[PDB]
Design a binder for this molecule. Sequence first.
Ligand code: GDP
Ligand code: NEC
Ligand code: SOG
Ligand code: SOG
Lengths: 196, 283
Amino acid sequence: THRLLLLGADNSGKSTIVKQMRFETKFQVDKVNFHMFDVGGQRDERRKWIQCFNDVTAIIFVVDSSDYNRLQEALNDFKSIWNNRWLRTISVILFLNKQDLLAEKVLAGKSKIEDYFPEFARYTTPEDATPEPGEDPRVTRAKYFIRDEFLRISTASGDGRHYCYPHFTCTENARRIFNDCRDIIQRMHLRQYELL
Amino acid sequence: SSVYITVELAIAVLAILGNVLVCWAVWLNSNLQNVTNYFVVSLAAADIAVGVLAIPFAITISTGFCAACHGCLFIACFVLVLTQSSIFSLLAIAIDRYIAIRIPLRYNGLVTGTRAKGIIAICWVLSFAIGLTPMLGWNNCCGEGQVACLFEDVVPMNYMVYFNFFACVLVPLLLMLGVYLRIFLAARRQLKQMTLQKEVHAAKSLAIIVGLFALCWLPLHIINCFTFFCPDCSHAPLWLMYLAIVLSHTNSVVNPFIYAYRIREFRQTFRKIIRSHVLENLY
Ligand SMILES: Nc1nc2c(ncn2[C@@H]2O[C@H](COP(=O)(O)OP(=O)(O)O)[C@@H](O)[C@H]2O)c(=O)[nH]1
Ligand SMILES: CCNC(=O)[C@H]1O[C@@H](n2cnc3c(N)ncnc32)[C@H](O)[C@@H]1O
Ligand SMILES: CCCCCCCCS[C@@H]1O[C@H](CO)[C@@H](O)[C@H](O)[C@H]1O
Ligand SMILES: CCCCCCCCS[C@@H]1O[C@H](CO)[C@@H](O)[C@H](O)[C@H]1O
């Protein structure tokens, strides 16, 4: 059975992601048991439960992409999780949540991200980026800017013992988690043969 | 021929040294003591038996010494059993890595320490069953009632070509080839997620595993097919036989290296053992 650590801010939808899948949560995918635990925000309840376990296969990290201000808080929390002594070799499945709400926010035009993140003004959408049919290039650009904001941290401590697997979430989250765990442990075996 | 005997004896020594070193490393190092290495230790155990028992028995079969036909068949069959177990324990590693890459989540729930012993036992029961099959009647059987003890005199070539080559070399090779190409594909997928220099290196490493197995085992068995299917052909020369036989046994020298020496954990353990053995004499 595969242990998961769920964490993220208040009103980051971390409670809804676990609602759809149905604190302690055990779900079935492809006849493979998972056992998730909800322990996050950075306010409290985190440092108690985190130091118990040890054998978590992966850390599910949920951030609200729409909340530009609390995004900085989320970035700090992520940096902390990424450099934590207890979680140093544990891979993070990253959910960038409330994508729909982000689309609305961005298309509206009231709040400009450059205000909260000035280096966005010199940011262009990546060439590898694969926007979906009917996605405003503006929305795509912002979306991928946030994603990259979290990824720069992952690549800052570029040891390669652990990796950060991003997602854009508005359907099938269980399968994403599944696939990402599959990848993690399959890459553990591939690394074990020096095939990496 | 003296050259055959001594080259064969060299390999036996190198086979014992390298494989004892692999086994010794698992005994000492605590991190190497896990289910995945049961398959490596079984392989290494089998290869020691090839060095200690199978090669000396193979040397005797080369001399055509005087013995009862069924005594000569027993020795030849003993060489077959031990070499077969080396090949099947090699296949077991590939099946393990196949489960690991194809079904990575259930790996720990499927591949238990007890079930791994099941697999290893099956490898050795299949070795005895196949290698002793000629003892049951499928055979070609000095003072009266003695013969020159030679391999191709007692062990029939239809057994070697239709049963032994098919079951013990060809099928394993095909399975291993297929398994390692699927493991490679998974590696190149994950490489793309995170330099085609890294992909080329990966491909090369898996090519070496299967390529060496084919280089060691196919020559002798290809020749055996030639012998069987062309009874009118003048038989393969005796220097070529010694070369091919030697090549097949040299799988037991490279089997340590490619498998174990491809693990960093084994590599570091080898340092500490050789170093601490020299620190021990120089005080
Ligand atoms: N549109 C949209 N709204 C969301 C999503 N996730 C959460 N919400 C809203 O955010 C509110 C708080 O979510 P909740 O899961 O309780 O946050 P948590 O307690 O921090 O996990 C709810 O009332 C939801 O309506 C999402 O993916 N899309
Ligand atoms: C399971 C396959 N085992 C072998 O090929 C071993 O059996 C012996 N062997 C097979 N065919 C012959 C042959 N034609 N002449 C002598 N030895 C043989 C060699 O010692 C090989 O190492
Ligand atoms: C969880 C309950 C397990 C009960 C035991 C199952 C029966 C098979 S035992 C297994 O049989 C192999 C023969 O194939 C031997 O080689 C091994 O030594 C031995 O371990
Ligand atoms: C596995 C079958 C071969 C067994 C014999 C081992 C010989 C390797 S000696 C040792 O190897 C280290 C890595 O092990 C290297 O870093 C060093 O250069 C060297 O000092």
